[PDB]
Every structure is written in structure tokens, then in C-alpha cells.
Design a protein around this ligand. Structure first.
Ligand SMILES: [Ca+2]
Ligand SMILES: [Ca+2]
Ligand SMILES: [Mg+2]
Ligand SMILES: [Mg+2]
Lengths: 619, 619
């Protein structure tokens, strides 16, 4: 693997051309050019200008050194810059470069290539050459190329083409490679010249002819390739970084758009609700107010909670937007007028104020409504209980001097006055029932039930009617031998059989009366009766009803059928044939039933063989 | 049809015996007897005693007339009695009877037979003989006998037997008749003698022998028969009359029995009810009082009406009983002590008083009950609304001089004091709900809803917590480069993702936080994620939760990833290769997406071919 002294001099000739081609590749950015590194650095000027372009620092070397002192002083300062960056330069003096020593000058051009073209590859344990080799090995994993050194591997040129297709496939077609050594080289150098910007640092003839190309010369060409690729990665890297930053802003805008339309909708909804609440008018009817109170319960359960949630969610979104921007060092976001979170917090407070104002005037309508329902029954009931009780104590009181006919007339007049109260009662009953619909079971305004009114009214009119017939009966006692206490009992029964208080007994009512008394055989079905029809026509005189006067007249006739005491003594005397005693056999001969006989036995005092009927006819 | 002078004298002989037999039939009741009417009336005494027995009047004739003057004076007074009753006696003088004239004396015995034995048959147009004939004709409708006169019809004797079987079949068997003339006669005279009490006024031999019996003689025998039958009808008649009177009394007793047991039951029932009402104790619970008020409604609808009906029905029964007795001239009925109608009217009034007293103390319990339900919610709610509002205005107020660390400490202490109020709230909520069960929708004691408490409490604790982190953030600004306004936004988001306010973010909660921020790929099912599990363990340090300090630390790290403005200028400069402008192609070479590019176009000011990014990096 040793080189030949002929091949060593060939390498140096190649290394001097490629090192020259690398210097003026950088100098051409400043219009400057050198012919030969081993002679054009003897004056020190061209080195300093090359150090200032790769080093980005101003060095003030003499533009036209005529004396060797300026050339050597030139190289003291120009070398000191290289020494400042960490490159080992123990061996060279400035005179070594002025005198034009080939091996040391090529070694000096070599150090600034490592420092300024592939310094990033070094990693404290790996030299710049080794890291660049690993860099070449990685980029060619798919390709059928073998990279073991900088000389033998690149001779075929197949590795030069894989590096460009790995980074920029667009530039050189990959199918037309793998073969010719002039073509694939010239194709790669051409490609690097027109679109990678790299001049053909390597001569196409000098590599195909030699057994092994010079290592350092090939590395210098790769160095330009790596340096332009590091830019391509550095722009891509900045391209990725600026993408993340633009996507966050673009997404953050989408939040600002969503916030603003939601904050506007909230305001608009809260404004619509308040207008409904502020506008409703409470009703004077209970079931209406209950429903109006119920609609505020739907709000507290429904939309109210939703507004409070949306308002708080927006205040979270607003803070989340601003939390991004502050982390991005972006100017904070500020919301449109009247749409910042604190304003929204106010609109919630503004609808809470409208709601509080609404339900307050609703319950005030409710108590006024219930009070009206209690009073709508209590006040007229109290007044009507008082009015009938006024008439009640009057008919109860019998301290008048006034003649009896005047009492009757005044009593009847007072009856008609009380009578009109009957029509007032149905409206009072609805008032208590209207309270049952409003489920009120507590009234502090009155203790009267409606029944008490109906009972008290119906009882007190009866008393009036009962006292009329009583006092009229006293007045008319001589005219008709009917005791006033009998008229009471007649009126009590008549009124009792009068289902509807029309003061007259129906054909149907009169039957139910007589069947009770047992004066006619009973027919529960209600079928026609010729005897009753004849009794009814006779009593009423076809007056279409049994007048009370006609009722009394019938009853008087039934009473008059019965025997007087003195008439009753003669009836018994005839049974006994004229003795104080009535023997059982005396009755049996008169044909009396056994139940009749047993009644006499059980009711008359025994006087020997017979029973003393003198007790009945006491007379 | 003319009689024979021999047969006329035969009739007179028969008429004298039968007229004699008729006189001593009446005289025998006084032990007196005469032999012959044509000779025993010549002294006038026997006529007067016969007139006094049939006439029921005292005549004082001389007991032993010796001179013709007393006999004739006897007959003046004795005849004058007969003349007083309407019998025509134009022809006779007293001397005609003293001298013993047969035809006129028989005519005189004949007139008092018509007047005192069959006078009732006469009916102004029908003589006593004719009416007696019609009386005989009627009683024999079923029998095969012919009655045309008093002589020929009775000769066979078949008509004598029909009269007894028509009135008293028990006495003579009817089958053994229709034939013999001695037998059926002797059988009838025998029957009349032993059980009808009629002596054999007719001789059995004198009728079978003669062609035609004497008319007047047969009529005299029938007259006794009619007179004893009139008694039999008169006793039966009195027997019927006394039956109607006993049946009414017996039935009227059945009413008194029914009244008394019903009047007792009423008293006993009214007494039982009042004891229940007076004994019940009102409850302090609403639904209990409502039911207790409901049980009084069942009474007013149920038993109350029934008591009032029974009381009034009894007052009708009582009057109906007494109305009968007064018509019967019977002593009026009086009810047992405490059971007369007016007493019953009192027991109704007594239970009405217990009912009125009951429902009155029921509604008083009702208002006290409802008032308690309103106050059980109103008073503690008002107190709790005031307490949180006390803390609310305090955290709202920032006028303290006190050092910031002291403010924090005092604020936290005030937070724990307010914190304890959370437990007081659930009991307040039940109090308003307990009002919904009691269907009360009107509260004058407070206007606060329960939601207002829950909102006000939850809002005011948040304010406290929010001010703690704010003031702590100011104090610790130099220690950690986190602006105090950023800590607010961190706490706002942290609290928002904290579902349960335990101050720590769950493994589950933290995911929902990061998925919102888009820092991890979303899985709605919730499946396992190795990347999230690794992010969560790292953040928390296996602390079983994201502490807020750990949350801030994570967020600071995410912010720190972003580029500084001066760092952001260099990123853009590298895209442009060092120009004020960023060309679209400069970005396209950096590989940016079209949406990224359009964002720059739409947001950066145009400066020639490129866009001036100097606005973003304002710095
Ligand atoms: Ca009627
Ligand atoms: Ca939690
Ligand atoms: Mg923005
Ligand atoms: Mg009685």
C-alpha cells in the first residue's frame, strides 16, 4: 500500500491544482483570483483576503507589499487569526510561507479547510476526516457503492453521484450511472457547477488516469459539497421552525374568530332574554301567574345555566389565546369593544338583575292574587252569614206587643227580604271552590264554611215559614176547630214530603205521603192506581197540586173519622154488653183478631175477669 | 084468595097466642107473665110494664087498680107514651082496651111491634112489613126457597132455616133440611130457643095443620129474630170500630219504639263524633295537617249531612206520631229525657260547635306550618347570602397597605373561613324543595333563589382562589421568569379542566387538557396511549396527579420551546438569504406548505417582490 516516489510527485501536482481551485472558489466572490497556491501566497495579501472571506473579520494587510518585511509582517497577523480559532499551527513560521515551501504551504491550506469547511464533523474523539467519512457512508445506504477511503472509493465516481441523489434527486437522473468513469464524473462535476454552484474543483482527466487519486485533494472537493449541504439543511431547518410558528398563529386566529362570533352571540342572546323578562306583565289570575312563575323556573334550569357556562368558557378561551401569545412573545390579544371577558361577566350580572327583578314582581302578584281569592270568598260569606243570623235571632225572639195579624204580616214581609238571599249563595260557593282549584287550604279572613251558610239559610227560612203557620193557626182557631199545635205538625209533614220547596204537593209527592201513612196500597214500581187517581182529583179539585189548605182539609177529615171519648165508651160498652170489664170472650164474639186482643191484655188494667177500659176513655 | 069465616076465627085464635107469647117474652126479663092479651090488658098494669121495658122510660101506673077509673087513667098515660113516638093511634080509646075488644087490642099490640121491633126497616115510602120482607129476600139468595108473603112462603119452614144459616151457620146444620115440616120447624124453634134466646113463639102444630098461617103472627116471630140479629150486627159493628182504633194505637206504638231507639242512636253517635274531634291534636308537619284538614272535609260531606238528616227525620216522625194521637183524642206523646226533638236540635248544634272549633284550630296550625316552611328556607338563605357577599366585597376590594405576603396569608385564612359555608348549602336547598312539596309558590320573607346562593358561593370562592395565585405570582416574578398575568391564565385553564375541584389534574383530566391543546393525537374511545402515559409519568413524577406547580412547569417548558424575536429575525433572514423581503420562492425552497405561504401573504406587508417580516419581529 506504499506510494511510489513517482506517484507521490503526481499527487502533489494534483493537490496543488485542487488547493488552488479551492482558494479562488472563495476568492471569486470578491473578483480575486490566484494562479498557484505555492507562489501566490508568498506575498501574504491573497491569504489575508481568503482568511477574511471565510473568517468574517477585517484584517488590514498591506495591499502592495514591496519589501519582505511587510510580507512577513503580513503573515504574522494573518496567521494569528488562524491561530485564534482552535487549530494547531506549531510548525510554521511566516518565513516558511514567504520562501514558498510546497509541503508546509499545502499543509497550511489544509488546516483552514478542516477548520472552515468540515469543522462541525469533529466530536472530541473523531477527526474531521473520519466524521466526514461516516457522513458519506450514511448517505449511501441504498446504493451499490463501497466507500472505504477517500482515494479508492471515489475513483469509480459512483459515490459522488449517490451523495447528490440522496440530498437532491431532482438534479441528476440516477439511472444513467454505474458505468462510465468519464461520464459519471463529468456528470457530477457538471451538476455541481450549474445548480449546486460548485466549480469543477477536480480535473476529470487526472483521476481516471491514476491508480489511486490523492486523498487530500478529493476531501477538498467533498468539503464544498458538505458546506453547501449544511446550508441546505440549515434553510430547511429554518423552514421547519418558521412553519411551526406560522401554524400556531394561524390556529390562534381560528380561536379569535371563534371567540368573537361566540362573544357576540352571547351578548345578543342575553339582550334578547332581558327584553322578554322586562316586557312581560303579571296577570291578575292565579293559574296564569303560576305558569308565569313556572316559565322563570325553566330559565333558571335551562338557558340561565347555559349562558353562565358559555360566558365562563369564553373567559377560558380568551385566556388560552393570550397564554399562547405570551409564550410566543407575540402582542397580546385584545377583544372588540364590549366583548372582552369582563364585559361578558357584566352581561351575566345584567341578566341576573333582570331575572331577580322579574320573579320578585311575580311573587308580589302571587300574594295579591291569593289574598284576592281568600277575600273573594271570605268577605261576602261573612256578610251573608251576618245577614241571615240577623233574621234568625228575630224570628227566634217573641217579645213583640204587636197584634198577631200584624206579626204575621211583618213576618211574611221579613220572609221575602230574607228569601232574596238564596240567589246570593251560588256565587259564594264558587268562591270557595275557586280556592280549591288554587289549592289554598288556609284562610285567615273567615272561619265560615259554605255548608254553614247553606244550612243556616235553609234552617232560618224554615223557622220563618214555621212561625207563619203557627201564628196564623192561633188566630184562626175558632173559625176551624184545629188546634194551633196540630197545624205545626201538619206543616212539618207537608214541608217534609215537599222535595222541591214549591209549597205544593205533586201527584207523585202526595202518593209518597199517603203510602207512608198507609192510606193506600203500596206500588213501588209507580204503576197507575185508579183509587189514588180518584183520591187525588178529589183532594186537589184538579188544582194540579195539593195546596196546604187542601192538605189540612184532607187530614181534618181523616181525624174526624175517629171516635170521641164518649163515643169510644159506648163502643166498648157494646162489646161488654154494659159492664166495666171487657172479657176476652166478649171481644172474640165481636170477631177481634188475636193481636187486637193481646193488645188490650197488655195495655188495660185487669179488673176481675175483664179489663177496665175506663182508663182509655178518661175524658 | 079470600079467607073463610072459619079460617078467620082460626087466625085470630093463633094471633092471640103468638101475641101473648110475644108480650111475656119481654115481661119475663122482669119475672112477669100474662095468660091472655085479650083479658090481661083490661087492667092496664101489664101494658105499662111492657111499655116501660121496650120503651126505657119510667111510667108510674097503679100497681093494683080496683076501680075502673084507675084502669082507664092507667091507659090514658100508658097510651100517651105510645102516641109520643110516631105511631098513628087515631082509633082507640082507653075504654076500648078496658072492655076487652079483641080486634082493637090485637091492633094495639100490633103497632108497638112495628114501632119497637122493626121500626128501622121503614124508609119513608116503604112500610115496616115491606122492608122486613126485602130483608128476608136478600138473606136467602143462595138457598132454594121462595119468599113471596109471610104466610105461604114460611109454611114449608125452609125460609126460617135459611135466615139462621145466613147469619149463624154454626148453629143449625144445613144438610138436614129441605123436607119434613115438623122437623125443620121444630129444629128452627129449638135452635132459636137455646142459643138465639128466642122462645118458641110459634106453635109447631098450628102451622102444619092450616092451609095458610096467619100473616101477623109469623111477622111477630120474625121480629124477634130481626131484633136479635140487629144486636149481632151492632156488636160486630162495634167490634170492627174498636179494631181500627186498636190497630192505630198498636201501629203508633211501633213508631214510638222506632223513634226512641233512633233518637238514642243519634245522641250516641253525635257524642262519639264530638269526642273524636275534641281529642285530635294538630301536627307540626304540613302533609299531616293537610290530611287532618281533609278528614274534616269527609265529615262535612259524609256523617254531618247524615246526622242533620236523621235529626230532621225524627222531628218529623215525632210530629207525625203526635198528629195521630191528637186526631184520635189520645193523650199526646212525650219523649224520654234528653230525646225530645228540641234536644236533638241541640245535639246538632253541639256537634256543629265542635266542628267549628276543630277546623278553626286546624287552619291556625296550617298558617303556622306554612310560615315555618317559608322561614325554614328564607332565614338561613338570607343569612348565607349575606355571609358570602361579605367575603365577596372583601376580595373585590384592593385598598390594603399590608405587604403582599401578608395579603396572601390573610386571603387564604379568609378562604378557609368562607370554605366551610359549602356544607351549609345542601340543607338550604332541601328547605326550598320542602316548599315545592308543600306546593307553596309565594314567599314574602326572601327574594333569594337557591341557585343564587350556589352561583354566588361558587363564584366568590373562585375569586378568592384566583386572587391568591395572582398575588403570589407578583411576589415570585423574579424567582421564576413567569409574568403574573400569565399565572392568571394558567390558573384559569387548570381550574377549568378540573372537573372536581380537588386542586389536582387526574390522568384522565390531563389528557382532556392536552387533547384540547392538540399536544397529543386524539382518541375519543379513551384507549391506552404509550406516548401520553410517558408524558404523564414525567410531568407528575408519579405523584398521582398534576400539581399546579407541575402544571405551570410543563407549560413554561412548552413556551420556552418557542423562538425569541431576535431568534425569530434570524430564522426569517435565513429563509431570505439575508434580505428585508421574503419571496414566495424563498419559502418554497424551505419547503413550506401553501397554507403557510398564503398566511404570510395575507398577514405581512408587501415590500416589492417579498414581504416585510420586520413587522413581526418588532422587538
Ligand atoms: Ca212539590
Ligand atoms: Ca381533579
Ligand atoms: Mg392574532
Ligand atoms: Mg202510645
Amino acid at each position: 500500500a506504499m506510494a511510489d516516489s513517482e506517484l507521490v510527485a503526481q499527487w502533489e501536482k494534483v493537490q496543488i491544482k485542487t488547493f488552488t481551485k479551492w482558494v479562488n472558489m472563495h476568492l471569486a466572490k470578491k473578483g480575486r483570483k490566484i494562479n498557484d497556491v505555492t507562489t501566490d501566497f508568498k506575498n501574504g495579501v491573497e491569504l489575508c483576503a481568503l482568511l477574511e472571506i471565510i473568517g468574517e473579520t477585517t484584517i488590514k494587510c498591506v495591499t502592495n507589499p514591496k519589501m519582505r518585511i511587510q510580507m512577513t509582517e503580513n503573515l504574522d497577523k494573518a496567521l494569528r487569526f488562524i491561530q485564534s480559532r482552535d487549530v494547531k499551527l506549531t510548525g510554521i513560521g511566516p518565513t516558511d510561507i514567504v520562501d514558498g515551501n510546497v509541503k508546509l504551504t499545502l499543509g497550511l491550506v489544509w488546516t483552514l479547510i478542516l477548520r472552515f469547511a468540515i469543522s462541525e464533523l469533529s466530536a472530541e474523539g473523531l477527526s474531521a476526516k473520519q466524521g466526514l467519512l461516516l457522513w458519506c457512508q450514511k448517505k449511501c445506504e441504498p446504493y451499490p457503492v463501497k466507500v472505504e477511503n477517500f482515494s479508492e472509493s471515489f475513483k469509480d465516481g459512483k459515490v459522488f453521484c449517490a451523495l447528490i441523489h440522496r440530498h437532491r434527486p431532482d438534479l441528476l437522473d440516477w439511472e444513467t450511472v454505474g458505468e462510465d468513469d468519464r461520464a459519471n464524473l463529468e456528470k457530477a462535476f457538471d451538476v455541481a457547477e450549474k445548480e449546486l454552484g460548485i466549480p469543477k474543483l477536480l480535473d476529470v482527466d487526472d483521476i481516471v488516469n491514476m491508480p489511486r487519486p490523492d486523498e487530500r485533494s478529493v476531501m477538498t472537493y467533498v468539503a464544498a459539497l458538505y458546506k453547501v449541504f449544511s446550508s441546505n439543511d440549515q434553510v430547511e431547518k429554518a423552514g421547519k421552525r418558521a412553519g411551526n410558528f406560522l401554524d400556531l398563529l394561524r390556529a390562534t386566529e381560528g380561536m379569535v374568530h371563534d371567540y368573537e362570533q361566540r362573544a357576540q352571540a352571547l351578548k345578543e342572546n342575553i339582550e334578547a332574554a332581558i327584553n322578554k323578562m322586562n316586557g312581560v306583565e303579571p296577570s291578575d289570575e292565579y293559574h296564569q301567574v303560576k305558569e308565569q312563575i313556572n316559565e322563570t323556573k325553566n330559565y333558571r334550569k335551562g338557558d340561565k345555566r347555559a349562558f353562565i357556562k358559555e360566558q365562563g368558557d369564553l373567559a377560558t378561551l380568551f385566556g388560552q389565546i393570550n397564554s399562547k401569545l405570551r409564550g410566543m412573545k407575540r402582542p397580546v390579544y385584545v377583544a372588540p369593544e364590549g366583548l372582552d371577558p369582563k364585559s361578558l361577566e357584566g352581561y351575566i350580572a345584567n341578566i341576573s338583575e333582570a331575572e331577580r327583578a322579574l320573579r320578585s314582581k311575580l311573587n308580589t302578584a302571587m300574594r295579591n292574587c291569593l289574598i284576592a281569592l281568600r277575600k273573594a270568598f271570605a268577605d261576602p260569606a261573612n256578610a251573608t252569614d251576618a245577614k241571615i243570623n240577623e233574621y234568625r235571632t228575630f224570628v227566634t225572639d217573641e217579645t213583640s206587643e204587636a197584634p198577631l195579624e200584624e206579626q204575621v204580616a211583618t213576618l211574611k214581609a221579613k220572609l221575602e227580604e230574607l228569601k232574596q238571599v238564596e240567589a246570593q249563595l251560588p256565587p259564594i260557593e264558587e268562591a270557595e271552590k275557586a280556592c280549591g282549584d288554587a289549592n289554598i287550604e288556609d284562610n285567615e279572613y273567615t272561619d265560615v264554611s259554605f255548608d254553614d251558610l247553606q244550612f243556616n239559610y235553609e234552617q232560618t227560612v224554615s223557622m220563618f215559614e214555621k212561625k207563619i203557620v203557627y201564628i196564623e193557626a192561633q188566630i184562626n182557631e175558632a173559625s176551624s176547630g184545629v188546634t194551633a199545635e196540630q197545624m205545626q205538625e201538619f206543616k212539618q209533614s207537608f214541608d217534609a214530603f215537599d222535595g222541591n220547596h214549591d209549597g205544593i204537593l205533586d201527584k207523585l209527592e202526595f202518593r209518597s205521603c199517603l203510602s207512608s201513612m198507609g192510606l193506600i196500597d203500596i206500588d213501588f214500581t209507580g204503576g197507575e192506581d185508579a183509587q189514588y187517581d180518584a183520591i187525588y182529583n178529589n183532594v186537589t179539585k184538579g188544582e194540579n197540586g195539593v195546596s196546604f189548605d187542601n192538605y189540612v182539609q184532607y187530614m181534618k177529615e181523616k181525624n174526624d173519622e175517629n171516635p170521641s171519648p164518649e163515643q169510644l165508651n159506648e163502643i166498648f160498652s157494646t162489646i161488654a154488653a154494659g159492664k166495666d170489664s171487657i172479657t176476652e170472650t166478649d171481644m172474640q164474639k165481636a170477631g177481634m183478631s188475636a193481636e187486637q186482643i193481646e193488645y188490650v191484655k197488655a195495655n188495660l188494667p185487669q179488673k176481675g175477669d175483664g179489663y177496665d177500659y175506663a182508663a182509655w176513655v178518661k175524658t
